[PDB]
Design a protein around this ligand. Structure first.
Ligand SMILES: O=C(O)CCCC[C@@H]1SC[C@@H]2NC(=O)N[C@@H]21
Ligand SMILES: O=C(O)CCCC[C@@H]1SC[C@@H]2NC(=O)N[C@@H]21
Ligand SMILES: O=C(O)CCCC[C@@H]1SC[C@@H]2NC(=O)N[C@@H]21
Ligand SMILES: O=C(O)CCCC[C@@H]1SC[C@@H]2NC(=O)N[C@@H]21
Lengths: 121, 120, 120, 121
């Protein structure tokens, strides 16, 4: 929550600005350094608002649909991962990027990858 | 349309509203796993899909905490809606559990769910 | 058993021999993608599965180069064999294309294939 | 081929010993630092034996079934990725680890992750 809330950057140079709400909500904006994308996009997600206290990360995920008021890529990414708190906080993720496709092309609709986010100030 | 009550091959129930500008908001009830009753979900979808026959890209997240249980985990589904006589949402998902750093290699399950509006 | 000729939901043909000590060896012919004719495959399976009803874990790889084409890519399938009257192999797969470093983020497709011995 | 052939170690401390054959074969052994595993396991896979020369990686993949003459985990991992050659050669991968399960448990059969291998000498 204060931990998650803030500005984060990944290894590609993308920017993630997020607010973690007391109810488990994540809201913010995402700017991707790569792909069919420009400017900021809405993100929404959820996190474990009462995580384990036993040295485990805090599970979370969020989605961006790659449509904003400037571009539409007809695609959406979800990130699933965990926040690791502390003075060098990290969010470690795997992601799935699905493009809208025709039925015949659905087998090649989804890319998979991994992003590591570092918190800035 | 996307709005409605959906069921996957496990018998889970996905109740969702698609807002006009791209929001997905609803609840998820899983038939399996460390889960009971409904959980909050939020996500996004392409609110102006292509007009060539392509599906509508979407995704959503559930954190597996509600008033009954907390599994200290979260699932994201990424996929596309395919309209038509038997509308479908085809997805792949990632379920990440909170882990220690040394166990992070085994933190994330992957799978695939297909949803229709047909009730079991 | 695992040995035989299998077909997935795309109509691809997977011909495989399961060696007694865990080898998988065969050929794969994809119905889709940058592919024509048969490609070599190799993999491994659990040659002494559990005796509790569980499936048999397995995986295999195809590099998409043969005498006809080279897509500069490789797919791995990871999954389990489920015996019975209608034997099945349920898999998830990763298709990695060779890319530059800057494009590595978009190098890998993920999907899921289910195989049976029923010919289209 | 000479490039791929050798000993490699990942971020977990696992050991990958591989030979790349002229026909596109990969053969060798894998020792995992983690999980239900001990000693070396057979691996087999394939690689693009005539890759692009345009600054792209060489696509490859391999499988380990986690049975050897000392332990059986009833599971198998596949790694899919690319070799990036040069004086600091790397193999960058994503992987899928499937466990044998009952039908009711099949939804939780498969773990996903990513490993980066560094070549040693
Ligand atoms: O090309 C598209 O369809 C839209 C942009 C997708 C960019 C992705 S999302 C996963 C990865 N992480 C990033 O920061 N950018 C890419
Ligand atoms: O066990 C947990 O950590 C929480 C429940 C997870 C259930 C999952 S989410 C992906 C899959 N699809 C479902 O409908 N249920 C399972
Ligand atoms: O286009 C390529 O790079 C080579 C062909 C890939 C075809 C894939 S592999 C996963 C999926 N299952 C199949 O039977 N065919 C596609
Ligand atoms: O626990 C098991 O079922 C067997 C061992 C699996 C270990 C895996 S494979 C992917 C990852 N990379 C490694 O080097 N070790 C783990």
């Amino acid at each position: 929550e204060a931990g998650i809330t803030g500005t984060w950057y990944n290894q590609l140079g993308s920017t993630f600005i997020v607010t973690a709400g007391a109810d488990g909500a994540l809201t913010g904006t995402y700017e991707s350094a790569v792909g069919n994308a420009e400017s900021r996009y809405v993100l929404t997600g959820r996190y474990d608002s009462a995580p384990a206290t036993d040295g485990s990360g805090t599970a979370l995920g969020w989605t961006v649909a790659w449509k904003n008021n400037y571009r539409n890529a007809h695609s959406a990414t979800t990130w699933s991962g965990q926040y690791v708190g502390g003075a060098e906080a990290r969010i470690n993720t795997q992601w799935l990027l699905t493009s809208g496709t025709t039925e015949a092309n659905a087998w090649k609709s989804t890319l998979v990858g991994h992003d590591t986010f570092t918190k800035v100030k």
